Design a protein around this ligand. Sequence first.
Ligand SMILES: NC(=O)C1=CN([C@@H]2O[C@H](COP(=O)(O)OP(=O)(O)OC[C@H]3O[C@@H](n4cnc5c(N)ncnc54)[C@H](OP(=O)(O)O)[C@@H]3O)[C@@H](O)[C@H]2O)C=CC1
Ligand SMILES: [Cl-]
Ligand SMILES: [Cl-]
Length: 315
Amino acid sequence: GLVPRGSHMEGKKILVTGGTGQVARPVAEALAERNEVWCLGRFGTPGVEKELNDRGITTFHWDMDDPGAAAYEGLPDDFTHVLHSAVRRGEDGDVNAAVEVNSVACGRLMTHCRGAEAFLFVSTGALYKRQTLDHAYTEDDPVDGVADWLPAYPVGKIAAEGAVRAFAQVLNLPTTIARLNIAYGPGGYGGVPMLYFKRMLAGEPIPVPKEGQNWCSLLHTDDLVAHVPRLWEAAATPATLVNWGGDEAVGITDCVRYLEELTGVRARLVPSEVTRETYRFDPTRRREITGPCRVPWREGVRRTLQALHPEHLPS
Ligand SMILES: NC(=O)C1=CN([C@@H]2O[C@H](COP(=O)(O)OP(=O)(O)OC[C@H]3O[C@@H](n4cnc5c(N)ncnc54)[C@H](OP(=O)(O)O)[C@@H]3O)[C@@H](O)[C@H]2O)C=CC1
Ligand SMILES: [Cl-]
Ligand SMILES: [Cl-]
């Protein structure tokens, strides 16, 4: 029951992109104990590269905005496992840059790592065509590129998924495409739940629907980290597609109310026609691959608050 995080996988050589980010940093940190881990990125945030190096992570400058093959000189080709979590996604409305940069980076990275045992590409649930608020989306539900908040983002992921599927087959590189739901946890900035809390602190409106509430499938960092080795094991040619979320249906308003409950901070719920969109996933396929999640969301969110905003909790 008490098992160290680093024991999920040992003796491998792991390439991680997006290793500074919300999703992949805890993964790289967890695997760095018993594996050789390289993080590819830009490391523009002061001190993050030092923090990763201090854990025994080898860091390697890698910018997806560089279109050429020269960017890969000096990078080993004997990685056994790859986690591609970085996303080139800088608001400018430039859908062509988003499609081009992300798609080409997938191709160049998979080709470089064509000898790997498994390649894991992180995608998003935002590319599902909106059905009902409470619908539990499956891997076969219709897809569109609609996102009012960030239009180029889901379109770029559709294009990147296309590249990933094609290179998986051409290279015979076992691959998993994991469309991630909302990740959260005590590291980084805490995920969407803490973004809501920040708005509550600032007195900013939180749109909610006229009837009911929005729904998601929150995934805690500790569960996310446990899942990565199982997602690599499920990698295949053709690529394995899975909706990657938690085991609990989490109402967004329920989450906001819980933050109020914990802190005494009041949310300004605005019943509204137009709300920021979230998606709940049917966990059936993911559970077949990973087994059940372990962290219930109310305890996870409470401890995330304690880690990132301890002063706003009753003392
Ligand atoms: N809740 C969530 O977090 C969700 C995440 N996802 C997906 O999960 C993945 C990781 O997301 P998340 O951790 O939240 O992202 P973050 O915004 O936390 O981090 C983005 C990451 O992308 C890297 N990156 C961005 N631009 C470049 C570039 N030009 N060259 C190299 N690296 C770059 C950054 O590296 P550096 O700092 O070195 O620049 C950083 O590590 C993405 O594919 C995203 O679409 C999907 C749904 C929800
Ligand atoms: Cl640094
Ligand atoms: Cl974008």
